[PDB]
Each structure stands twice: as C-alpha cells, then as structure tokens.
C-alpha cells in the first residue's frame, strides 16, 4: 500500500492545462483513488474520485486518466484559473477504512502575456519605518533599492499579483532620519525615481 508522487512543483499559466502524476501501488482487488487539494489556509477539499472498475471519471474541469495495467493515475485541470494555486494530494482507499496519502504536489499559476507597463513608485512613512510602494508592472524584474546614509534594517520586497493581472510590490525598511529617504526602481532598462512625483 504505497502512493508515490515524484513531482515537487509545477508552474502553468492561466487558461492552459496541467497533468499531475500519482504512482499508487496496492494488492487489493477493488479500490478507489481520491484526489484532494489543500489551500494555504489548511483546508482539504475533495476534488474527484476514480473507481477502479468503470471508465474515466470527470467532473467539470477535472479529468482522471487511469492506467490499470500500469500503476499510473493522472489528474487534468483544464482551463486554469487564479485560485487553482494549492497543494494537491493523491489518496488511496466501510466506514472504518483509512486513506493513504502521497507527499503532495504544488501548482503555482502564473498570469498571461501582457505588454510592459511602468512602475510609478511612491513612499510612505511612520516616523522611523518607510515603505516604497510600487504600482502595476507586468514583467517581474524589479529592484526596489532605497537611499539613506543611515541603514538599520531592510526586509525583502513582496511581489503579488494584482486583480488587473500585473504586479505590486512593497519593500519596508527602518532608518533613523526617515524623511530624506526616496526609493528608486530599475525596472525594464529604464530607471524610475520618486522625485518626479513629489512636485
């Protein structure tokens, strides 16, 4: 009774398709294979169930490819979306029975192709904490360095997908003077300061 998933991570863009592999192994004669997904808020949701006696089970945007002669089963998620970013588990399995899970594969969904836009950075203070705010920009090649002669801490930027399909980033940093600090950006071969917005 073993379930093997030798896939660490996958990256597939929006409205494409993805196949996930699951090598089960058992000695029973009639079993079921369940598929579960785990949100980052730690919730398990039943996706699809493949009974090992009748043909391929599909339910909406999910499809299961079953190789009974081999030991391979495969989940298809067609027409991907933005909340298909989870961790997916293969389970093997009347009220007393247990499910045997695999180690789980992670699907990270990337946005589509967009023309390049420009950052338009800002800055905001709280006495000693600063925060450079970068507005929407499509390619993820960003460098959000700040300017201060007196540096204490500088955490990493946090790039996240906007609801427009582009990216936003915040980079915190604690300094002493915290008033003569102005952030800069090296996005897409053209430097963007924050003094042109100031006046």
């Amino acid at each position: 009774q073993k379930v093997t998933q030798a896939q660490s991570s996958v990256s597939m863009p929006v409205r494409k398709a993805v196949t996930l592999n699951c090598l089960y192994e058992t000695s029973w004669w009639s079993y079921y294979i369940f598929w579960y997904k785990q949100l980052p808020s730690k919730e398990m949701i039943f996706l699809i169930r493949q009974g090992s006696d009748e043909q391929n089970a599909k339910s909406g945007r999910y499809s299961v490819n079953f190789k009974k002669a081999a030991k391979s089963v495969a989940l298809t998620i067609s027409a991907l979306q933005l909340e298909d970013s989870a961790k997916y588990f293969c389970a093997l399995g009347l009220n007393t029975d247990k499910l045997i899970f695999g180690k789980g594969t992670r699907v990270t969904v990337e946005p589509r192709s967009q023309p390049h836009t420009k950052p338009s950075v800002f800055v905001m203070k709280n006495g000693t904490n600063v925060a450079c705010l970068v507005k929407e920009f499509y390619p993820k090649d960003i460098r959000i360095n700040l300017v201060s002669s007196k540096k204490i801490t500088e955490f990493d930027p946090a790039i996240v997908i906007s609801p427009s399909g582009k990216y936003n980033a915040v980079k915190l940093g604690k300094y002493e003077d915290s008033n003569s600090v102005t952030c800069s950006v090296q996005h897409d071969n053209k430097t963007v300061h924050s003094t042109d917005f100031e006046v």
Binding site: K42, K125, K135, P163
Partner: protein, 213 residues
C-alpha cells in the same frame, strides 16, 4: 483554523469544527512538513473507545465529548515532535475534513508579550492627485504562533475588501507580516479597518485597527 502553543511535557486540547449529526466514527489525522497525512486513531461513538495505530502505547491520545456531537482530542505528555496540523474526518462517497488546527510545541522561549503590534501607515500626498486613489499599510510584528489572518472591512458593512498580503517573514525569534489595501476615489475619506485574528490576542477577542480618511 487557529493555533495552540503549549510547552513540552504538557497537555493540549484540539477541537474540530466539523459538525455532523449521527456520526459513527471520528478519525484523526496528522500532517507534518514534507510528509503525508497519516491517521493517528479513530473514536467509536456508539461504544466510546479509541482504536489506536500500530506505533504507540495508550496514554497519549484521548477523545473527549463535552457535549453531544462535539469532540476534542486531548494529547498528553507533549514532546517537540508532536507538532503539526490535526484534522478530524468522517465518511460522507467521500471523506470530509475539518479545517485543521496547528499545534506548536515550544520550550517556553517567549518570555514576553507576543501579541501582534500594528504600526499603521497613511497614503502619500502625491498619490492622492495623479491616481485618484490612496493606499493604506498595516504592518504587524512580534507574534509567535504565525497562524494569523488579516482582512479589511469597511466603516460599517460586512464586505471583505481587496487586500494584498505579504509573506510572514521571520525575525530573530519572532515574526512579522504586512497587509495593504487600495481604495478608489469616491470612497476615500471614510473609515476602514484592519481586523487581525490571532491566538495570543488579548482577551481572546481579535484586534480591530481603525484607519483615518
């Protein structure tokens, strides 16, 4: 989902929210990092006895029913290798799961207050002409169990606003998170909230940070 932060050689209560009428067996699963969810035990409810796994002696796991159709898994003599996410499950086919409960087992290395402490920010003055909008920023820090949930609400409504969080970055022994929200033009000068759910939040009630115009 929440967190539990008991020390070593202690007892921990883990309750699950899965409300089901006329159950027969309640399974208990454990998920650790880079491993699989394994069943620890399952509790008969028509006979009230635990059936354990092939690995440990009795005197470690106990299923307590405080009321009818409510279950708590009590762990005993906590060791540092007991930490993970604990689910409860029932059959129907499918097997429903119970939203998880992280348990953290520490050596009492806190020694201070570990409540999330906000240091909120205000939108810049130049953003509020050439964008017709403004952005808040709600930085939290110095909180230990790391199961935290920041969501933004209106001045008086029940809507969840389009916040955009960040990664729970780790300091030398504590943690730090920040969330931020962009609001449009004609809903700008109102009040906004930065509700923060956490375990080591004073009086049990979660925080509620009010944001100016």
């Amino acid at each position: 989902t929440k967190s539990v932060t008991r020390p070593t050689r202690s007892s921990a209560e883990i309750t699950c929210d899965l409300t089901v009428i006329n159950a027969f067996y309640i399974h208990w699963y454990l998920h650790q990092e880079g491993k699989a969810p394994q069943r620890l035990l399952y509790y008969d409810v028509s006979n009230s006895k635990d059936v354990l796994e092939s690995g440990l002696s009795p005197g470690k796991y106990y299923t307590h029913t405080p009321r009818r159709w409510s279950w708590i898994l009590i762990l005993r003599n906590l060791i540092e290798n007991d930490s993970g996410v604990y689910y409860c499950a029932t059959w129907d086919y499918k097997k429903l799961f119970g939203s998880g409960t992280t348990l953290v087992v520490t050596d009492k290395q806190l020694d201070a207050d570990v409540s999330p402490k906000p240091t909120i920010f205000l939108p810049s003055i130049a953003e509020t002409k050439l964008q017709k909008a403004g952005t808040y920023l709600c930085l939290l820090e110095k909180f230990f169990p790391d199961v935290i949930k920041i969501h933004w609400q209106e001045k008086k409504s029940n809507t969840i606003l389009g916040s955009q969080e960040g990664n729970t970055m780790k300091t030398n022994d504590t943690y730090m998170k920040f969330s931020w929200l962009t609001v449009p033009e004609k809903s700008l000068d109102k009040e906004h909230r930065c509700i923060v759910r956490h375990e080591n939040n004073k009086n049990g009630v979660d925080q509620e940070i009010i944001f100016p115009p």
